[PDB]
Design a protein around this nucleic acid. Structure first.
Length: 259
DNA sequence: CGCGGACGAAGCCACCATGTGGGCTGTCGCCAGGC
């Protein structure tokens, strides 16, 4: 069976502190563990990186951010723990595996159920596949002309590398076109219309440092005190199309990652 | 009656400042004598 894991499979290009020659691609778990070692991890698509730094800020960061500044001058104490871990200069791998451990079997995007940032049921109710060309950026869609980025005629399209596929999926989850995508029925409801992505047409500002760990630490908005939150992949069960997108005072609702 | 073409359905977000230049041409006086 096909399987890919963000934690173990290599997709994230990584640059080391030394030499600055031959960046190697690594998984998400490895980057997390070897963070002080690497200066940065890079994605060729700025949309892909714009959502990427958002999700990476919810993993390493969440564990370090703690999701809980109650009493004690909240802002002051989070900045105190912040100074404490910033002083350590690194994250203990055992707390990473523990986080990964909670949902270790839930990451491999190609999951039959619970695929990464995806809806698995979707396959059954949509008659026409959008196609890779409609998903991937710089790639021509059905109505798009054949002039740029290699010519894709939408007949025998060359498949995206799985690592490549991951970058695109993440971008479309951030930036995404609005109106007239392919309709899927849900108990009688068919509406090809689609609204735009949450950050669409914007510049995301991520502070950097000398090493990875620094940036990841300095990348988390301070979560105000509020309801405990979780991510789309931290959701216990699927949302369903109908109904209200519930609010989320937690930072996962402030990383625009609740839904 | 069937096929092809055209149109429609959204999601849509705003008291006061200016300076540079240089590259192309031709002429007699004629004859005779001496070296």
């Amino acid at each position: 069976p096909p399987s890919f894991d963000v934690t173990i499979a290599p997709w994230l290009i990584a640059r080391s502190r030394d030499v600055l020659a031959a960046p190697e691609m690594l998984g998400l778990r490895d980057v997390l563990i070897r963070s002080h070692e690497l200066s940065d991890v890079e994605i060729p698509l700025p949309p892909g990186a714009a959502v990427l730094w958002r999700i990476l800020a919810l993993i390493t960061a969440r564990i370090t951010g703690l999701d809980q500044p109650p009493n004690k001058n909240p802002k002051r104490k989070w900045q105190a723990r912040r100074s404490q871990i910033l002083s350590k200069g690194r994250l203990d791998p055992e707390a990473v595996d523990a986080y990964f451990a909670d949902y270790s079997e839930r990451f491999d995007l190609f999951h039959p159920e619970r695929p990464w940032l995806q809806d698995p049921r979707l396959r059954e109710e949509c008659p026409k596949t959008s196609g890779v060309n409609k998903l991937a950026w710089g790639r021509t869609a059905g109505e798009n002309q054949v002039w740029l980025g290699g010519h894709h005629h939408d007949l025998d399209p060359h498949p995206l590398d799985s690592a490549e596929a991951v970058w695109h999926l993440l971008a479309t989850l951030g930036y995404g076109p609005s109106g007239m995508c392919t309709a899927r029925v849900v108990r009688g409801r068919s509406e090809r219309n689609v609204t735009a992505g949450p950050l669409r047409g914007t510049v995301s500002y991520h502070p950097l440092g000398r090493t990875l760990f620094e940036s990841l630490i300095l990348n988390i908005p301070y979560p105000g005190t509020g309801a405990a939150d979780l991510a789309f992949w931290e959701q216990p069960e699927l949302n369903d199309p109908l109904g209200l997108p519930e609010e989320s005072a937690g930072l996962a609702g402030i990383l625009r990652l609740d839904h």
